[PDB]
Amino acid sequence: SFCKVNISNPVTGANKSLMIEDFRKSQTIHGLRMASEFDGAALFRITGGNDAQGFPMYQGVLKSQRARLLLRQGAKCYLHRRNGERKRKSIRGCIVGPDLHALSVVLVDAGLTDVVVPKRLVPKRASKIRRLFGLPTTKVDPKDQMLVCELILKPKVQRVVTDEKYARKQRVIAEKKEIMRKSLQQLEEYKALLSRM
């Protein structure tokens, strides 16, 4: 094609697409790098893109051509098969130039932003449901088994301090003291024994 511009607005949650000539000449967008502000009068912040042959941009390479790189496990553009495996790959079609067949862009500080997408998933951690509802996260009645969720597979709150779990922890501590007490008694017995001998 020429250039598919994937715009994405996180303030509301939408995604839109456009097109542009993006040919070899002036193009006031050319010469910008990933994570840069432009004024979007021809189509805002660049965040990625694929060129022709579908090679993805990579942050920091500071070139408008492709490059090889030894990519390491944990880094972008690589999915490893064994722990500790690396791989040499090709990247970065441009710092945005005429080559790119795609751009990725995000909108800051607002055709116009209209749609508001719902959040599919609800908070799950026990504190995650106390910051939502303004409840304190410090009490002796933290149970919080309100079940609404608006029937929206996902709930099963985590990190809840129940009564039996409290008993479990207290039991482990009460045994971690018994060990030390019996150990000190045995040490005393042995010292007294050698004293007698």
Binding site: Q186, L187, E189, Y190, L193, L194, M197
Partner: protein, 258 residues
């Protein structure tokens, strides 16, 4: 290789296991635990190969999943668990309690024992050493560890351990005239009395013993286990550690088909 061995070919298995050379390429490899590879028996080789409570490997597993077997008072759910000398072997649902000893041909046998006897174990003191913050420890032939032992216990003595508390109630000193049994070599399994201890600076110390019929034999000090003081603290097989010669063994064999 590049790492540890996990297999064991059938022809390479220890010869006192009495494994047969057909019916398998592989043999079970004993898991690490209280006993070493050479001087042990995998637990499966008793339940399937010997007593026929199980008849295959897969159905030998299910007996040990539902915990019908106790070793030294604990249920072992592992088929290649190493059981060995002096381990208590008790199957409750059949009410069988055994003690694992050697016969007069260096093989493991099970000796029936009473409920008044299966609550204790004899161990051999292998070493005394200072651990953490300078505390004394003793180690046994079962990979057992005891802190603060009484100062009289020295190496090559044997100790008697209750099988629920895991503590010491009795000890026997290694001396002249003590009753003893040989745990390995080529006099393995027979029982006698110590009549000599010859130390060689730098090298092995040899022990000379004499049977109850007066036959004398020799071995290394790393192979003599004290079972009491002129009277064995435990029960022993019917042969009582007397080994026949090949002619008398042959006449007893001729008499079985007779």
């Amino acid at each position: 290789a590049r790492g540890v061995r996990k297999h064991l070919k059938r022809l390479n298995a220890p010869k006192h296991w009495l494994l047969d050379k057909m019916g398998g390429i592989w043999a079970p490899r004993p898991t690490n635990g209280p006993h070493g590879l050479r001087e042990c028996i995998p637990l499966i080789l008793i339940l399937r190969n010997r007593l026929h409570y199980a008849n295959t490997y897969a159905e030998t597993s299910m007996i040990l999943q539902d915990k019908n077997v106790l070793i030294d008072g604990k249920p072992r759910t592992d088929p290649t668990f190493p059981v060995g000398f002096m381990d208590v072997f008790e199957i409750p649902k059949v009410h069988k309690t055994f003690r694992v000893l050697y016969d007069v041909k260096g093989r493991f046998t099970l000796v029936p024992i009473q409920s008044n006897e299966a609550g204790f174990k004899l161990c051999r003191v292998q070493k005394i050493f200072l651990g953490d913050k300078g505390m004394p420890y003793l180690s046994t032939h079962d990979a057992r560890t005891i802190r603060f032992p009484h100062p009289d216990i020295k190496t090559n003595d044997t100790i008697k351990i209750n099988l629920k508390t895991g503590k010491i109630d009795e000890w026997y000193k290694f001396d002249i005239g003590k009753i003893v049994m040989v745990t390995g070599g080529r006099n393995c399994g027979r029982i006698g009395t110590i009549q000599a201890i010859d130390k060689h600076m730098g090298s092995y110390t040899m022990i000379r013993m004499k049977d109850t019929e007066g036959t004398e034999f020799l071995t290394r000090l790393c192979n003599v286990f004290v079972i009491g003081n002129d009277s064995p603290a435990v029960a022993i097989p019917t042969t009582k550690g007397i080994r026949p010669d090949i002619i008398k063994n042959r006449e007893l064999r001729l008499r079985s088909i007779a």
